[PDB]
Design a protein around this ligand. Structure first.
Ligand SMILES: Nc1ccc([C@@H]2N[C@H](CO)[C@@H](O)[C@H]2O)cc1N
Ligand SMILES: Nc1ccc([C@@H]2N[C@H](CO)[C@@H](O)[C@H]2O)cc1N
Ligand SMILES: Nc1ccc([C@@H]2N[C@H](CO)[C@@H](O)[C@H]2O)cc1N
Ligand SMILES: Nc1ccc([C@@H]2N[C@H](CO)[C@@H](O)[C@H]2O)cc1N
Ligand SMILES: [Ca+2]
Ligand SMILES: [Ca+2]
Ligand SMILES: [Ca+2]
Ligand SMILES: [Ca+2]
Lengths: 292, 303, 303, 301
């Protein structure tokens, strides 16, 4: 079992990642930490809690950074339309996500993996507030970046663009990094038949996936959970990656040295291709785990 | 009494600021928070605790950020030396930091207050920026921020930048875009508060723990000048009597561009940008007034 | 016939572009202008003149900018060698550059024209930018600019930047903000045109002066490819644009110092909502392209 | 006599610098080159030509760069004087070519005096790098080690073409910088105008017509009973450098887009440990300077 903390900004695809992480026997989901991103933190928190309540996921949820570390906040109704939820009974823990991340890593034996699928604000604050966490982190498997074309701008993918300075901290940490960028995640196109596949499986997870993906196309965040379940399903390439924090046309770009021209040691395993038959099989496996 | 939290990286002149803040009846020093800057946090924390122990200052001390929010860490081992507070000899340290992180202390204290607390940052702005972004509801709770840092003219660590800002430019950008009333004691002002041999003699002659401390500290730093300004303490002077310091309201922007002006406080002295002022920038200080205050504070420790 | 001025820094692939441009009946090559790039201008000029002499191309050659407009000069001595055109041995050089500076030639030729001339820059954009800013009245006279440079994906000289743009980013900014119709043969397209062992064998079979030159030239870059023909794609494009698929995009040149200096930022998906300014090369029919190269090379065989 | 080429964008104070340069026996004014700056090149050229015609200055005038080398053009155009119908014209040679050819043919004794944006100078330097050792010195009006004018960070001439200024400041040619810190001290008051006006002649009337306008639109805008003369300080410097205190500094031009675009970053305290590249103007003896202005005016009588 890979122990993980899932840091997210739900978010339609975050919800799918939560669904997969909380159920699969290859994953030990220790906690869910929430960051502002797709929407403001008040909304992403409610969204995360709504998902956990509907799926009866009893993992603690921690609210983190409501704002990026430096830049003016950007966002991408509720932030998770489609599924209708019960009146919210479950709540966030009283501990700040940044403190939770620090304390959990400090008390561990270095076997915990961070899985950020939102802006990297919680992660960067934790890293700079307690640098002793760095050798405690086994790996960081993040959804974010693009070696090719971004989405929010031609240069930048949303998660990085939303907090470039936080991304710079993470990408200069020296912790082993895995980057599921848009180049990879844009390949995981969910089609009506994928939705129809999951509906027939049914249960709480099946309906939620259907409700979410009907409203929404790529699933992005869930690829990080796929990767931790079976890395063989995803081809990566080791690259030296630098985050551009210059104001201007490449603000929040992940500059990926695909050809090794800079002669710098690689710092990231960059997602290249995904076996989508493998991936959807896994999504269904996770969906079927919620039937009582 | 102005309630303050003094955020600092001792630091020779930080220690002078602590001495002043903890004693003057116009100041209610609620807590001392420590940041990395002059030296690494392990050292600035020991330095701050050493000063409080020697002066018998019973105010809680909180350790904060050991690193800036984004950039690769720099120190000032240029002026402050090995420990970062050379000159005085301290007894073995028995006093310790609180278990609460400085960032949490700042948030909790501001959130629980009625908005009458002033932050006094005299190191890099790392603690302040983290507190602000972690809990933006603190913003209207902050009465004012009186910071030592910046320069409208020439910097120190680079031509463009003063050390506190240069040590965490992204943190400084957060503070200078917060919308909270700012007062900036930049180098243009603080370079005027040069401590001469006779200012040192004046404090030695007054004596007691604080006179000895001032003397050991400043006699060391003046030795490095032969081979000096007090900077941080002007923020405390300003809160005691703002009439002693002439300020000018300016729109100030922090440059976070990598390059020759990284960490520059760009101060619109002539108002050419047509933007509302966000900072009262220090222009001139009455040094007779200032040294009188320093002596007043030194005598408070006479036991 | 498309009238062109070919602006180049020979350069192995520049030589192939000269060979194609000077011979094909769809092209009226008015003049060759030389810029520093692959090597310093003294060398690229000698290289250009060497090519023209060997192929008996009687078109005037003009020396232009020896330096980029702002940055510290870089060369590509890694691929192109000591001379900038290592490989072919040339007879003693008897032919020479015209006395007119390339920048003046470009301005004068455009100003005197009826607006039917196309510029074909296949080196850094230094000559073009200087001409544009020295005489802005040339802008409406330029029919189109078909340039080799840039990359919407990965660069070559850095991960972000292609050599020609990287060698003079500020010049490239001028060209990409000129409002003149632009065609960009970037690396994404040109990397599809690799010259393998079978390509060299084919050309030298066709033989004669251009055959032997292709082979001597392209064997050196294969000997440094123990570890593409780029420039000639611009001439291919002008002969038959149907052989090359382009996509209209808003392209911006990044002149920020840092990891994307000299990047052509290409808005592939139109997310910025700005009007396209460039037809960006996407794919090339390589059967069509090599057919054209042979058509051109055959044109040189002797009686 | 110091041989100079005066590169300018007239411009009220450029006109004063022309007046001084063309008359003083310590200066050999070889040619005037014009650049876009204060106004577009069509207008600055006409302004330059008007000044020369009115003062009967017969030095050849060359039109140069109408645009900066990279950035989108900005402007800041010579009110006060009334000029007769213009008959003088620019030479047919582009100023950039003139500068290159004149330097290449020389023995290295010519000084360049740029008092507009540095566009002509940068293009000439990159077009023909062999001119660099031919340039004895560059005495420029531009920059500020403290506060700029057009932005808090930047002085107009540099701001108008930062990339050109980066070229000049990295050229290795000895530089003298009359920045705003110096020139803002050169305050022309009513008594200074009186002195020139009462000396009389064409240059005294021109000074007076120009500066009266400058003073009227210094009083109406901020009054402020005087206004700086900037460009002419470069000519004062070449006549007698003793009148102006300079300090050697390593200066770097910031070309980053943002709040310090076009800033001259001047290492006043030497903290970067880099060799000085610029003699930066610190203070001027204004009694000396106004005496010299009057002397120049009198040369036209
Ligand atoms: N447009 C858009 C905006 C925001 C997102 C969110 N950001 C990452 C991919 O960029 C994913 O984690 C999405 O949840 C995704 C998309 N597609
Ligand atoms: N050189 C030097 C570097 C850093 C400092 C510290 N930073 C501010 C002034 O820049 C003050 O807060 C000093 O504590 C002081 C000095 N003297
Ligand atoms: N490495 C390298 C460096 C420079 C060049 C030259 N620059 C453009 C391609 O980027 C072409 O115009 C080549 O002449 C080519 C290569 N292959
Ligand atoms: N405001 C103003 C703007 C521009 C100028 C022009 N630029 C330099 C001073 O910055 C001088 O060369 C003036 O001609 C002068 C003034 N006075
Ligand atoms: Ca997400
Ligand atoms: Ca301090
Ligand atoms: Ca080339
Ligand atoms: Ca001028």
């Amino acid at each position: 079992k890979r122990k993980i903390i899932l840091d997210c900004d739900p978010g339609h695809d975050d919800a799918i990642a939560i669904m997969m992480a909380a159920k699969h026997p290859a994953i030990d989901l220790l906690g869910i930490t929430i960051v502002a991103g797709n929407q403001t933190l008040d909304k992403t928190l409610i969204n995360g809690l709504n998902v956990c309540q509907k799926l009866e996921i009893n993992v603690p949820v921690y609210a983190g950074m409501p704002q990026p570390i430096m830049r003016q906040q950007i966002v991408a109704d509720t932030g998770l339309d489609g599924p209708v939820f019960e009146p919210l009974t479950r709540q966030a823990e009283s501990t700040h996500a940044v403190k939770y991340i620090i304390d959990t890593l400090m008390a561990s034996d270095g076997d915990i993996t961070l899985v950020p699928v939102g802006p990297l604000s919680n992660i960067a604050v934790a890293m700079r507030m307690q640098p002793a966490i760095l050798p405690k982190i086994r790996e960081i498997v993040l959804m974010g970046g693009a070696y090719g074309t971004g989405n929010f701008t031609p240069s930048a993918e949303f998660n990085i663009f939303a907090d470039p300075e936080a991304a710079r901290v993470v990408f200069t940490s020296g912790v082993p990094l895995v980057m599921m960028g848009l180049d990879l995640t844009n390949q995981t196109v969910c089609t009506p038949d994928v939705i129809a596949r999951m509906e027939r499986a049914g249960g709480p997870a099946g309906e939620l996936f259907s409700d979410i993906m009907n409203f929404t196309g790529p699933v992005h965040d869930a690829t990080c959970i796929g990767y931790l379940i079976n890395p063989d399903g995803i081809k990566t390439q080791e690259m030296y990656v630098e985050v551009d924090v210059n104001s201007g046309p490449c603000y929040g770009r992940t500059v990926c040295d695909e050809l090794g021209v800079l002669g710098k040691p690689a710092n990231t395993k960059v997602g290249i291709t995904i076996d989508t038959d493998w991936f959807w099989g896994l999504v269904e496996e996770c969906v079927r785990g919620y039937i009582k």
